[PDB]
Amino acid sequence: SKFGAISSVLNDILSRLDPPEAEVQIDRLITGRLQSLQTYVTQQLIRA
Amino acid sequence: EVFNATRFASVYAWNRTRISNCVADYSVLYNFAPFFAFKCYGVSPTKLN
């Protein structure tokens, strides 16, 4: 999932844009993935 | 060839071109350019090759 960014692949966004502009994209990816992981952990806790 | 054409078309009829089956080296673009505006949006201009 692109999560509202240019690309959904960390390796290729890193290899396409320079750090001081791709930092926003990777931060967006980090937010999306962290939210998904939090959802997974919460559901796992409930089922446990 | 794209850079030293002598008859760049006007904006109302923006002439198109196709670049394929070749190795893109942008150092020639840097050479043939007293650059004034090189704002690159979807990609970093430094990292093109």
Ligand SMILES: *[C@@H]1O[C@H](CO)[C@@H](O[C@@H]2O[C@H](CO)[C@@H](O)[C@H](O)[C@@H]2O)[C@H](O)[C@H]1NC(C)=O
């Ligand atoms: C847009 O600009 C292109 C780059 O010069 C033109 O292509 C060239 O066309 C000439 C004449 O046909 C060829 O000899 C040359 O190899 C190259 O392909 C192109 O013609 C131009 N567009 C129009 C509509 O003329």
Ligand SMILES: *[C@@H]1O[C@H](CO)[C@@H](O)[C@H](O)[C@H]1NC(C)=O
């Ligand atoms: C076109 O080619 C000539 C050949 O030497 C070169 O001197 C000139 O700088 C070129 N122009 C562009 C815009 O690339």
